[PDB]
Amino acid sequence: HMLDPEEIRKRLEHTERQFRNRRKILIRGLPGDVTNQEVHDLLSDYELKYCFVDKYKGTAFVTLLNGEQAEAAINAFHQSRLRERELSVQLQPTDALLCVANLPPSLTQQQFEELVRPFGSLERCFLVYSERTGQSKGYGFAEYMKKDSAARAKSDLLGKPLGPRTLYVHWTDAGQLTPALLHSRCLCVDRLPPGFNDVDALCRALSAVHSPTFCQLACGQDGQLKGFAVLEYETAEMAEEAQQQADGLSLGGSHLRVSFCAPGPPGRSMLAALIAAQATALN
Amino acid sequence: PSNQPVNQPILAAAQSLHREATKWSSKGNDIIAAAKRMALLMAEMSRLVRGGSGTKRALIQCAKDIAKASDEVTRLAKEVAKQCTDKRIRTNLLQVCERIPTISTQLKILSTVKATMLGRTNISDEESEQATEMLVHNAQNLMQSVKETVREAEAASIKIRTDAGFTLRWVRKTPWYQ
């Protein structure tokens, strides 16, 4: 059921506002005798929510009101001079960002907030949608105020059943993300026929629009099937197009379920990680 | 080596709770851990009610152990309900778990009744059989209430307040793919 242009724009804008809500900066290169006041004076045009100045290291950890203030402070003071010291002003390299994948595609942004909110205060929380249809890609990102919150979330969500799905959780480097890199190049195929042993017929079926660069069945050290397959396509547009025609397609008397993987890793890394997660949980 | 005679209805009720609880990991879920002990205790009860050496004292203690594990399931379910933002789930959870202490008190009383009969020889077969039936009905009610609590606590896990206090972990012990 196709979404009206107003709903598509509403979803994509919410995801864009959420993705851009990075308001924590890190200042390095401060003079040895710097004071808290000097840092407050430097950033007097902005509203400081938090400011810790480490006098022993020449660094400051500052939380500004929003992402717009953070970018403005960065542009204004990155590589500027403070009493002849060159300053580095960059987004804080926090480690509290998770990708929650294999979500039901019907799961709403509100339901995704309800799922990830009990573990702590959220800095960023958004589903990733198709730019063309506005439909959810079945994965989202949650960034907490604290790393301990994200660890607690990953522990409770990794291998959690939600509808006809088992969620996957992957720690993501906030620094490695861009709006383009939010769109996954990997697909996950499950609902294979029982005792499926024809990988070639699977890669061909999944080659109907675009040819995958990677296509392997998941299997343990003893070679036995783990229940799924991982595929990789050259681009995000190619993976999205392949997923659209292949999802629900009949193969060997079974209607395949084709989903998106967490957007970061290549096929080989994704396949090993998904096998590892399931094995750890079963044993 | 020697397959002990059991009460099949109390064993089937125990096995049904065990099936339900082993769908989940016990790590970060003390309800699941307690539910798993209740099932193995209820499986011991299916052997105890058939009589034998020292079964009087054993049956009384087994119902006390089941009641202690029940108390824990109820304590934990009330901690989950206190963090739940959905009125319907919160109400179901509190309703479905407040009956558990009542059923376990009746199980301790019904265990003592049957235990006192195992220790005697002047009790009629009809009386002995109905004392077992009462334990059967109680055990079925208790295993059902614990399955219901486990289902409502799990349904609540996605309806918890922001930055909550107490939460339970719901991670499957069954294959992840379809």
From Swiss-Prot, chain A:
Report the portion of the entire protein shown. Answer: 39 to 319 of 606
Q: What does this protein do?
A: Cooperates with PTBP1 to modulate regulated alternative splicing events. Promotes exon skipping. Cooperates with PTBP1 to modulate switching between mutually exclusive exons during maturation of the TPM1 pre-mRNA.
UniProt name for this protein: Ribonucleoprotein PTB-binding 1
* Location in or out of the cell: Nucleus; Cytoplasm
Subunit structure and binding partners:
Interacts with PTBP1, RAVER2, VCL and ACTN1. Part of a complex containing RAVER1, VCL and ACTN1.
Motif (Nuclear localization signal) spans which residues? 9-24
Per the UniProt entry, what species is this protein from, by scientific name? Homo sapiens
Instruction: Cite the entry's keywords alphabetically.
Output: Acetylation, Cytoplasm, Nucleus, Phosphoprotein, Repeat, RNA-binding
What's the main place this protein lives? nucleus
Q: Where is the RRM domain?
A: 23-94, 96-174, 185-263
GO cellular component terms, semicolon-separated: cytoplasm; nucleus
Q: What GO molecular function annotations does the UniProt record carry, in alphabetical order?
A: RNA binding
Superkingdom field: Eukaryota
Swiss-Prot record, chain B:
- State what this protein does: Actin filament (F-actin)-binding protein involved in cell-matrix adhesion and cell-cell adhesion. Regulates cell-surface E-cadherin expression and potentiates mechanosensing by the E-cadherin complex. May also play important roles in cell morphology and locomotion.
Q: Which residues of the full protein are shown?
A: 957 to 1134 of 1134
Region C-terminal tail, annotated ranges: 1-178
- The disulfide bridges present are none
Tissue expression, as annotated, is: Metavinculin is muscle-specific.
The name this protein carries in UniProt is Vinculin
What family does this chain come from, according to its entry? Belongs to the vinculin/alpha-catenin family.
Annotated positions of the Phosphotyrosine modification: Y177
As for subcellular location, the record says: Cell membrane; Cell junction, Adherens junction; Cell junction, Focal adhesion; Cytoplasm, Cytoskeleton
* Classification of source organism: Eukaryota, Metazoa, Chordata, Craniata, Vertebrata
Q: Which disease is it linked to?
A: Cardiomyopathy, dilated, 1W: A disorder characterized by ventricular dilation and impaired systolic function, resulting in congestive heart failure and arrhythmia. Patients are at risk of premature death. Cardiomyopathy, familial hypertrophic, 15: A hereditary heart disorder characterized by ventricular hypertrophy, which is usually asymmetric and often involves the interventricular septum. The symptoms include dyspnea, syncope, collapse, palpitations, and chest pain. They can be readily provoked by exercise. The disorder has inter- and intrafamilial variability ranging from benign to malignant forms with high risk of cardiac failure and sudden cardiac death.
Where are the residues of the annotated region Facilitates phospholipid membrane insertion? 47-90, 164-178
Please name the source species.
Homo sapiens (Human)
Q: How is it modified after translation?
A: Phosphorylated; on serines, threonines and tyrosines. Phosphorylation on Tyr-177 in activated platelets affects head-tail interactions and cell spreading but has no effect on actin binding nor on localization to focal adhesion plaques.
* Oligomeric and partner information: Exhibits self-association properties. Part of a complex composed of THSD1, PTK2/FAK1, TLN1 and VCL. Interacts with APBB1IP and NRAP. Interacts with TLN1. Interacts with CTNNB1 and this interaction is necessary for its localization to the cell-cell junctions and for its function in regulating cell surface expression of E-cadherin. Interacts with SYNM. Interacts with SORBS1. Interacts with CTNNA1. Binds to ACTN4; this interaction triggers conformational changes. Interacts with FLII.
